[PDB]
Amino acid sequence: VQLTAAQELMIQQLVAAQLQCNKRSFSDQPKVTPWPLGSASQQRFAHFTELAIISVQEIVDFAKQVPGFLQLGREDQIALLKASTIEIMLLETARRYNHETECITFLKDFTYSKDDFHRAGLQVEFINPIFEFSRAMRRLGLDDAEYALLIAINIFSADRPNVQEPGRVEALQQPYVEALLSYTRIKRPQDQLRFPRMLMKLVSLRTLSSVHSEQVFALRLQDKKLPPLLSEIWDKILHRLLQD
Amino acid sequence: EEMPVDRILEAELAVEPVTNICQAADKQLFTLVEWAKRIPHFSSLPLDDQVILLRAGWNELLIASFSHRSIDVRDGILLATGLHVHRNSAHSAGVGAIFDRVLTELVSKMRDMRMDKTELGCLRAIILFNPDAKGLSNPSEVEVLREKVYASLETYCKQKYPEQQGRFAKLLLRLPALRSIGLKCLEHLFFFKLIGDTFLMEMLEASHKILHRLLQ
Numbered sequence: 001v002q003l004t005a006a007q008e009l010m011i012q013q014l015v016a017a018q019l020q021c022n023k024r025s026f027s028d029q030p031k032v033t034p035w036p037l038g039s040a041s042q043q044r045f046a047h048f049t050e051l052a053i054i055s056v057q058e059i060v061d062f063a064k065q066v067p068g069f070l071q072l073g074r075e076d077q078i079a080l081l082k083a084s085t086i087e088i089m090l091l092e093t094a095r096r097y098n099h100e101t102e103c104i105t106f107l108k109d110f111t112y113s114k115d116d117f118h119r120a121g122l123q124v125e126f127i128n129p130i131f132e133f134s135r136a137m138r139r140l141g142l143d144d145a146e147y148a149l150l151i152a153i154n155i156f157s158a159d160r161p162n163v164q165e166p167g168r169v170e171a172l173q174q175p176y177v178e179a180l181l182s183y184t185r186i187k188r189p190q191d192q193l194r195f196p197r198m199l200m201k202l203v204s205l206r207t208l209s210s211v212h213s214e215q216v217f218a219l220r221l222q223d224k225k226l227p228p229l230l231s232e233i234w235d236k237i238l239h240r241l242l243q244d
Numbered sequence: 245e246e247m248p249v250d251r252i253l254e255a256e257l258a259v260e261p262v263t264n265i266c267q268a269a270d271k272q273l274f275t276l277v278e279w280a281k282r283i284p285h286f287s288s289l290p291l292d293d294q295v296i297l298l299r300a301g302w303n304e305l306l307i308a309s310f311s312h313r314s315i316d317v318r319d320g321i322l323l324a325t326g327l328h329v330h331r332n333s334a335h336s337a338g339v340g341a342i343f344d345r346v347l348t349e350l351v352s353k354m355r356d357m358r359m360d361k362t363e364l365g366c367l368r369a370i371i372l373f374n375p376d377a378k379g380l381s382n383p384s385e386v387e388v389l390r391e392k393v394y395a396s397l398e399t400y401c402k403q404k405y406p407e408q409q410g411r412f413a414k415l416l417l418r419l420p421a422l423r424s425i426g427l428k429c430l431e432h433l434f435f436f437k438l439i440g441d442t443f444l445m446e447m448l449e450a451s452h453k454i455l456h457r458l459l460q
């Protein structure tokens with residue numbers, strides 16, 4: 001029925017924090033190994049890997065600005081980011097999917113199809129679910145506020161491995177769920193299923209997190225090695241990034 | 245309603261160390277097929293799709309059921325075979341981490357919410373009607389049924405627990421936790437298959453004699 005001023009202001013802050021974090025990532029564009037125009041393979045893999053890193057950094061800056069997140073202990077902050085990063089990477093990936101070109105756009109003008117993802121070294125078993133999830137999110141027609149809220153909710157999941165203060169995390173999560181209920185019921189009152197449909201994407205994301213482990217398994221099989229940051233996060237650089 | 249909660253409640257009620265869990269699972273699978281038949285519109289679906297949904301969901305479906313059954317138990321779960329499994333034994337058998345997650349994320353939460361049987365049946369119906377299960381002839385048809393369950397369950401929550409405005413969401417937010425827990429339990433079951441029951445084994449493979457027969 002209603003959006004409190006507090007709710008409105010919190011949603012505004014999250015949306016502002018995403019935009020601010022996007023700008024930072026875009027500064028880092030000329031830093032990335034260029035997309036080649038057997039070492040073109042190695043170059044495409046390096047390229048993709050670099051975008052993943054920038055995404056992780058972006059996610060960290062974003063969490064730091066989510067009101068509440070900094071009041072948790074540093075080991076819980078880490079445990080929540082370790083678990084949620086791939087999921088948020090997927091959300092942010094879907095968000096950059098264009099259904100007309102069937103391409104995903106990273107940074108400003110790095111446009112990639114399914115085949116591009118294959119040429120970068122990912123396997124079909126991973127790529128297909130990524131694109132199926134992107135299509136599914138496009139059907140939902142989420143706006144920037146909804147995306148930001150769903151990311152906040154996703155970070156504050158009390159069930160992740162090694163959360164020492166889960167009661168605190170659930171309490172942080174609750175207002176963000178409440179705000180998303182209010183926001184979507186005002187945005188589309190005639191569509192009462194929008195809210196649970198969103199929430200259920202959190203379930204999809206647990207599965208996708210698992211498809212990703214299978215991709216990491218395949219990389220070991222192929223003897224492809226990941227940079228430190230990504231090895232750490234997916235099995236104290238994260239620590240450093242938070243400390244800044 | 246097109247998916248009345250009454251019929252879902254009827255379906256729950258109409259169904260009342262390492263290897264003990266596997267024995268209980270084999271039995272409960274038989275009950276599960278009967279439960280699903282009682283769920284509105286499930287048997288209207290094509291037969292191969294009924295089979296697909298039950299292969300995709302049995303694991304989470306059973307875990308949600310024994311979790312709710314174990315609300316009275318303290319530091320353990322009550323299997324349908326009447327057997328009780330305690331924390332100590334679970335850790336002895338190297339299955340202690342997942343066991344503690346079940347108690348922390350499922351049982352405990354169901355206890356502190358006083359989750360009722362209708363609420364449970366709706367969650368399980370949602371788990372059942374999974375439009376992302378591989379090889380469905382018509383995913384839309386299944387999505388629509390899931391969405392009817394969303395509508396009926398929200399409605400029921402507003403009518404019965406009007407004092408608790410966030411209750412619908414609290415229910416739905418057990419499902420991510422249940423999905424991840426599902427993935428970890430399936431892991432363990434796959435290990436038992438590789439190391440030291442007929443229906444259960446049929447479910448763990450990719451041919452479905454028992455499931456096909458039982459739904460006719």
Ligand SMILES: CC(C)[C@@H]1c2nn(-c3cccc(S(C)(=O)=O)c3)cc2CN1c1ncc(CO)c(C(F)(F)F)n1
Nearest residue numbers: 025048049051052054055089092093106107212215216
């Ligand atoms: C596709 C994704 C799962 C993930 C990813 N996410 N973003 C991303 C997401 C959002 C924004 C931006 S960006 C450039 O606008 O900042 C970039 C870019 C990428 C590439 N990628 C990826 N994921 C898993 C693995 C190993 O399993 C690998 C590896 F290591 F195989 F290459 N790469």
